[PDB]
Design a protein around this ligand. Structure first.
Ligand SMILES: [Zn+2]
Ligand SMILES: [Zn+2]
Lengths: 213, 234
């Protein structure tokens, strides 16, 4: 079981944003929810506890609500320091291989125009195949805001095993970059007609495809 | 309120490790405590929890039967005894304080409030790495341009730097004579403990029959350098 959150939300300074946390039932539906903030190179910080109560020192901009199996965090008057990751949590969600924390969500304070990712997908080199290894490489560059969702497919089928993906990183031109690798046996590689890398960013998904020679 | 973690280093699978978190500037004996972990660069994951006196212990199912949380209030110290480590246990381990202030009401403690499951204070954390990998240099493979690039526009050519340890690795192109059509990406932590990254450069397609392109990888921790020529091939 999981507390699913949106991968990302974005807004200009001063605007309002909302973040959802959906579960059940046995967790949210009958239990308190807490929200935590985490800025890049620091430790998490409690923003909300008992659904809507703030600890001391937390701006009144941050508010929490809860309805049915969904909880919600709300930030009014977005400031630049609000750009961070946000996680929802409930102490009930530990009880069956389930995760206490949400997924969670990246909040972006817009400070430049949005940019769609340039996606490049490389098949395994012949040199790597002669070494009895196959690695598919998906490179995603020059996108903003810095949040993407990468998914792999083998022909029409979805893939999750053998996949590793990096967190987005700030390039020199203030835009973001990321990469995803799909590690593979030449048998697996040759067994399908094609493999595809699907990158999702801002209501758009670009899929690139490669096939055995 | 201060939480300081320690004990986190590199370690091999199957073996063991004991993490420690010392707390100060608060009544450590009145609050429950939690161990929470964060693998890079992912989300938070609650590992273990303990009440103020240690009568009530909680462990995630990921670690049930191989991790054990404990505390010594006489020394204001929290302990996480990890055994049978796995590569999946590789993460940054945070010590976190439970929100609820607790005292015993009836006489272990018969009647109590218990932990709340809310983490109001954290402590930067200590890194635990599980890898059976000793120091070794990378294998470099060419990421060749698309065949459908001949004449006209542009082409992305790169090199894949695979299976090395530890960090860091650096990549240049043509000995520094080529510095921007260029992206060098962060590395990934493969399941084998070994690291991998890629570097790509975008150039004109007409230049792919005259100009030679070479990626220069440097991996100092293993005293290795690798120069790889990236050809269009057929
Ligand atoms: Zn670029
Ligand atoms: Zn297939």
């Amino acid at each position: 079981a999981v507390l699913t959150q949106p991968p990302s939300v974005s807004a200009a300074p001063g605007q309002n944003v909302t973040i959802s946390c959906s579960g059940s039932g046995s967790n949210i539906g009958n239990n308190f929810v807490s929200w935590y903030q985490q800025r890049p190179g620091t430790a998490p910080k409690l923003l909300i506890y008992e659904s809507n109560k703030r600890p001391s020192g937390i701006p009144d901009r941050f508010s929490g609500s809860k309805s049915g199996t969904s909880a919600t965090l709300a930030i009014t008057g977005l400031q630049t320091g609000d750009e961070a990751y946000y996680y929802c949590a409930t102490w009930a969600a530990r009880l069956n291989s389930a995760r206490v924390f949400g997924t969670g969500t990246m909040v972006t304070v817009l400070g430049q125009p949005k940019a769609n990712p340039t996606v490049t997908l490389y098949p395994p080199s012949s040199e790597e195949l002669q070494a009895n290894k196959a690695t598919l490489v998906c490179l995603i560059s020059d996108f903003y805001p810095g949040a993407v969702t990468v998914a792999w497919k083998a022909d029409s089928s979805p893939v999750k095993a053998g996949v590793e993906t990096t967190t987005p990183s700030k390039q020199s031109n203030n835009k973001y970059a990321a990469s995803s690798y799909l590690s593979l046996t030449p048998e697996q590689w040759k067994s399908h007609r094609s493999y595809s890398c699907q990158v999702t960013h801002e209501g758009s998904t670009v899929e690139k495809t490669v096939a055995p020679t | 309120v201060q939480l300081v973690e320690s004990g986190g280093g590199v370690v091999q699978p199957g073996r063991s490790l004991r993490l420690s978190c010392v707390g100060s500037q608060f009544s450590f004996n009145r609050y429950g405590m939690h161990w929470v972990r964060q693998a890079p660069g992912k989300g938070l994951e609650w590992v273990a929890g303990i009440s103020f006196d240690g009568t009530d212990r909680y462990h995630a199912d990921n670690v049930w039967g191989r991790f054990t949380i404990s505390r010594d209030n006489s020394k204001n110290t929290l302990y996480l005894q990890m055994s049978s480590l796995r590569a999946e246990d590789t993460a940054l381990y945070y010590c976190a304080k439970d929100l609820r202030e607790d005292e015993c009401e009836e006489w272990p403690c018969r009647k109590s409030r218990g932990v709340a499951g809310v983490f109001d204070k954290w402590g930067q954390g200590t890194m635990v790495t599980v890898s059976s990998a000793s120091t070794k240099g990378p294998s470099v493979f060419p990421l060749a341009p698309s065949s459908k690039s001949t004449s006209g526009g542009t082409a992305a050519l790169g090199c894949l730097v695979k299976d090395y340890f530890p960090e860091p690795v650096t990549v240049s192109w043509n000995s520094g004579a080529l510095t921007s059509g260029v992206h060098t990406f962060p590395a990934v932590l493969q399941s084998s403990g070994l690291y991998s990254l890629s570097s790509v450069v975008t150039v004109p397609s007409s230049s792919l029959g005259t100009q030679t392109y070479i990626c220069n990888v440097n991996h100092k921790p293993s005293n290795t350098k690798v120069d790889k020529k990236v050809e269009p091939k057929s």
